[PDB]
A paper describes a structure:
The armadillo repeat serves as a scaffold for the development of modular peptide-recognition modules. In order to develop such a system, three crystal structures of designed armadillo-repeat proteins with third-generation N-caps (YIII-type), four or five internal repeats (M-type) and second-generation C-caps (AII-type) were determined at 1.8 Å (His-YIIIM4AII), 2.0 Å (His-YIIIM5AII) and 1.95 Å (YIIIM5AII) resolution and compared with those of variants with third-generation C-caps. All constructs are full consensus designs in which the internal repeats have exactly the same sequence, and hence identical conformations of the internal repeats are expected.
The structure of YIIIM5AII without His tag was determined in the absence of calcium ions and refined at 1.95 Å resolution. This structure is most similar to chains C/D of His-YIIIM5AII (r.m.s.d.s of 1.14 and 0.60 Å for Cα atoms of residues 14–288 of chains A/B and C/D, respectively). A superposition of YIIIM5AII on His-YIIIM5AII based on the N-cap and internal repeats M1–M3 (residues 14–168) reveals that this part is very similar in all chains. However, in this superposition the C-terminal repeats of YIIIM5AII match nicely with the C-terminal repeats of His-YIIIM5AII chains C/D, but they are shifted towards M3 in chains A/B (1.4 Å shift of Trp201 CA towards Leu158 CA). However, in YIIIM5AII the spread between Trp33 Cα-atom distances is extremely large, with the largest distance observed between repeats M3 and M4 (the distances between Trp159 CA and Trp201 CA are 9.42 Å in chain A and 9.43 Å in chain B). This distance is probably too large for binding the target peptide in the desired conformation and this mismatch is located almost at the centre of the putative peptide-binding site. Although YIIIM5AII is considered to be a full consensus design regarding the sequence of internal repeats, the internal repeats are not identical in terms of structure. In the more stable YIIIM5AII structure the side chains of Leu16, Leu20 and Val7 adopt a uniform distribution of side-chain rotamers in all repeats.
Numbering used by the authors: 12 to 292
């Protein structure tokens, strides 16, 4: 079974290569134990090589297989990294084929769902400037994939947060707080919340980027999920130092937060209360 399949990934007969590729992709879309069988069979170097196939269908299906491998456990994500997939994945971020572009983004997002070391490998492969550019894609699906991927990177340690800030992501993220698309809006809030879960100077960069007026407004959102994400991100900002806290107060937050203490949702009441007590000493 799997050793023959892997051999055929190098076959000059394209029907063999594709037949082997479709069976491996099937297997890699199962559980982690199946993913491991594929990795242990030695499929990764050849799958990485197929990221240069001039055949677009083959390229895309190799990409989908890697993305599935990368939805596995952190050691499975690390094998993808150790097989040298990141440089090609980053190049693919400038593919004019939007289905290929999307699958590269999805795969990088999966890799960035790993541990902080896996996230750092994504940063070190130079993914950030392209991800930041993709935040102004006219394609909503592309934009959402880039956003998801950035949010994942921003969910790592403070050094990972710092690279996102350093790559210039903040102004784009704050602009997306005007998005009329509710999913985009939610994921931008969530990404800013993750940045604002860092150090006080990382909180200050969010403030400096102009996020507070939209955050405070969104405490009155009719979508409870949006309200909650705004309130979480704001509560993170309010956990900063005195200069951070003073800026929250001057943005008008005390009045909305008090209003929230009578909200029917207990998580909202409690979050608002925590926020207020931080802000008031």
């Amino acid at each position: 079974e799997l050793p023959q399949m892997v051999q055929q990934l190098n076959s000059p007969d394209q029907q063999e290569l594709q037949s082997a590729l479709r069976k491996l992709s099937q297997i890699a879309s199962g559980g982690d134990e199946q993913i491991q069988a594929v990795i242990d069979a030695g499929a990764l170097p050849a799958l990485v090589q197929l990221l240069s196939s001039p055949n677009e269908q083959i390229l895309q299906e190799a990409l989908w297989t890697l993305g599935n491998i990368a939805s596995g456990g952190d050691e499975q994500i690390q094998a993808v990294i150790d097989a040298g997939a990141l440089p090609a994945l980053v190049q693919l971020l400038s593919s004019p084929n939007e289905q290929i572009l999307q699958e590269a983004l999805w795969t990088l997002g999966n890799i960035a769902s790993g541990g902080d070391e896996q996230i750092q490998a994504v940063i070190d492969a130079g993914a950030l400037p392209a991800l930041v550019q993709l935040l102004s894609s006219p394609n909503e699906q592309i934009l959402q994939e880039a956003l998801w991927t950035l949010g994942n990177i921003a969910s790592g340690g403070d050094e990972q947060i710092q690279a996102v800030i350093d790559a210039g992501a903040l102004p784009a993220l704050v602009q997306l707080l005007s998005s009329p698309n509710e999913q985009i809006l939610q994921e931008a809030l969530w990404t800013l919340g993750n940045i604002a879960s860092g150090g006080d100077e990382q909180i200050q960069a969010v403030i400096d980027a102009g996020a507070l007026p939209a955050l405070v407004q969104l405490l009155s959102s009719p979508n409870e999920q949006i309200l909650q994400e705004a309130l979480w991100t704001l509560g993170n900002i309010a956990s900063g130092g005195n200069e951070q806290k003073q800026a929250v107060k001057e943005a008008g937050a005390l009045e909305k937060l008090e209003q929230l203490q009578s909200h029917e949702n207990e998580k909202i009441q409690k979050e608002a209360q925590e926020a207020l007590e931080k802000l008031q000493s």
